[PDB]
Amino acid sequence: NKSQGVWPMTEREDDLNVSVVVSPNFDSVSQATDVEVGTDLVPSVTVKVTLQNRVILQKAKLSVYVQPPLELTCDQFTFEFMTPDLTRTVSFSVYLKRSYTPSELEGNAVVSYSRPTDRNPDGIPRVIQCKFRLPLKLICLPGQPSKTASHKITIDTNKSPVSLLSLFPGFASQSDDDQVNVMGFHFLGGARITVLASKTSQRYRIQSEQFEDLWLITNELILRLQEYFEKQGVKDFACSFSGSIP
């Protein structure tokens, strides 16, 4: 019935099938997820996520993962209904078990919505991933450093002299430190790691009692360098040497 009007259907449906027709719609924005961290302290750090909207959605679910030394008190959640362009949020806190070392430090959170385009009665699925930084003052009890000899690696900068005490709040020696050249960086559960090269060395090296623990700190030393220098405008990104001795 309607042998010419039904013929317009198959003469039109053969266009998308001849093409790929995978994600033909503009899927630019249909969600927005951002996570922000407060300035709290040891193990329990409160943290806050958000959700945005542009279309009514359904079958929504948000999950969040870290490395297994870290764990989360409040596990993954739900977000039941959506109206066009509202916001909702959920807060939670990260728990720390008595392991030794997390591999990386940042976890990521992921949401799973389902938009109901007219080709299907239910919602075709989509997944949006966000990531979030995590500080290191939740793994924090910096004792007095120990000037010893162990495994070493060497870095350098473009502009050499940087006071380590100014790079962050004073971690080691909360009492009256008579030395700025202290490199007290005890950041694990039961370890001892110092840094080196406060003043007299243009080369910036670092020693570590065991060769397990430099990964959490030198990139942190790389970022805290780059967290300092944009308030000065130097944009330094160079050095390393001798990847064979590790």
Next chain:
Amino acid sequence: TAMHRAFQTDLYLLRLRAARAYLQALESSLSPLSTTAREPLKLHAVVQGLGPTFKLTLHLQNTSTTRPVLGLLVCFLYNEALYSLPRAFFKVPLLVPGLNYPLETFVESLSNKGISDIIKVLVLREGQSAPLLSAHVNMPGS
């Protein structure tokens, strides 16, 4: 002569009924085959997966000769039954062209039900269009 015209107008609905059901799943990308990122996806319930515990393998393999696809993401959204699947979101290794990869999980069902999972694989950051999502139909465990 009546039989010939009976075949065409019944076959003419058949091309329409197929393509209206083909495009109903191609836009949802239910098929385990792809063209842009070129791997297929086979998956199975293994023999040790019986009872309250349950083990689910997954098989990825590139179909290029020299083009290693790089660092994709596998995540399975699923209607929440009483099982856990504690990882639930991997980062897939670098697929070499030619080898097949076993990828195993651990369903921990608590009581006796049955409901299908949907396992997706995504490209790295931009395209959330989810190629090769495989609606795995589960076995009813005890």
